[PDB]
């Protein structure tokens, strides 16, 4: 659940889910083994994915690709509960992640990118407002976890803003992509915390 372990959840989990359709036992064996290795040495799953891509001559930027896939595999992250407040959280989360996932395509179009930045700030505000509402609605359950995640989110959002400012000076897109992935990870962690309120 650290940032550096994000690719396990974002890339490998969906692959294991698809492999479950081929052979449940084998898929679970692979899943458990990747989980164990990542726990023993955080960052290994990323290194493994990049190495496999290199061996198969897939010439892509890993960070950018991770960002482009941010709106995918919705069922891995969404709160599977029918009440309006969880649906609302899911939708705010999805909206944010969707807008962020389009940065790689929009960043080279200056007029469009300026609008993207405003849409991101709006989606962040609405997510945080909803988080606070549901937090209060369930009487501040999971308090320490949610307060800590909210604090990190605000920190990561400020850091994302700083990264945009710098990008307007130096044009180095990768730094925006890194900072956007962090916000995606923190969005997913907040959703996860609401899975266990009752």
């Amino acid at each position: 659940t650290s940032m550096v372990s994000m690719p396990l959840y974002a890339v490998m989990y969906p692959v294991f889910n698809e492999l479950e359709r081929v052979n449940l036992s084998a898929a679970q064996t692979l899943r458990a083994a990747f989980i164990k290795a990542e726990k023993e040495n955080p960052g290994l799953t990323q290194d493994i994915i990049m190495k496999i891509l290199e061996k198969k001559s897939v010439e892509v930027n890993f960070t950018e690709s991770l960002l482009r896939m941010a709106a995918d595999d919705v069922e891995e992250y969404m709160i599977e509960r029918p009440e309006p407040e969880f649906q609302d959280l899911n939708e705010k989360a999805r909206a944010l992640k969707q807008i962020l996932s389009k940065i790689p395509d929009e960043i080279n179009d200056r007029v469009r990118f300026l609008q993207t930045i405003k849409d991101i700030a709006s989606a962040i505000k609405e997510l945080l407002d909803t988080v606070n509402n549901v937090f209060k609605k369930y009487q501040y359950q999971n308090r320490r976890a949610l307060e800590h995640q909210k604090k990190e989110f605000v920190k990561y959002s400020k850091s994302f803003s700083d990264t945009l400012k710098t990008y307007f000076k130096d044009g180095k897109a990768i730094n925006v992509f890194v900072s956007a992935n962090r916000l995606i990870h923190q969005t997913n962690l907040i959703l996860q915390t609401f899975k266990t309120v009752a």
């Binding site: 492999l19 081929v22 052979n23 084998a26 692979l30």
Partner: protein, 65 residues
């Protein structure tokens, strides 16, 4: 070459050996890599071709974007 491709020996083994060479005196990391390769071999013995399918789906995710 003509005869013989084995995703595990073709792709995973060399990949993992190269992984270890990124940080050679890292005991905990190398142990983690060794355990994982062993489990991949167990999975491959239970379902021949599963490693190839893992690599294909992995690649597909990145090509499709």
């Amino acid at each position: 070459d003509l005869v013989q491709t084995s995703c595990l020996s073709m792709i995973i083994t060399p990949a993992f050996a190269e992984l270890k060479q990124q940080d050679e005196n890292n005991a905990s990391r190398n142990q983690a890599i060794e355990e994982l390769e062993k489990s991949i071999a167990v999975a491959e013995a239970a379902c021949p071709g599963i490693t190839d399918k893992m690599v294909k789906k992995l690649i597909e995710k990145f090509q499709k974007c």
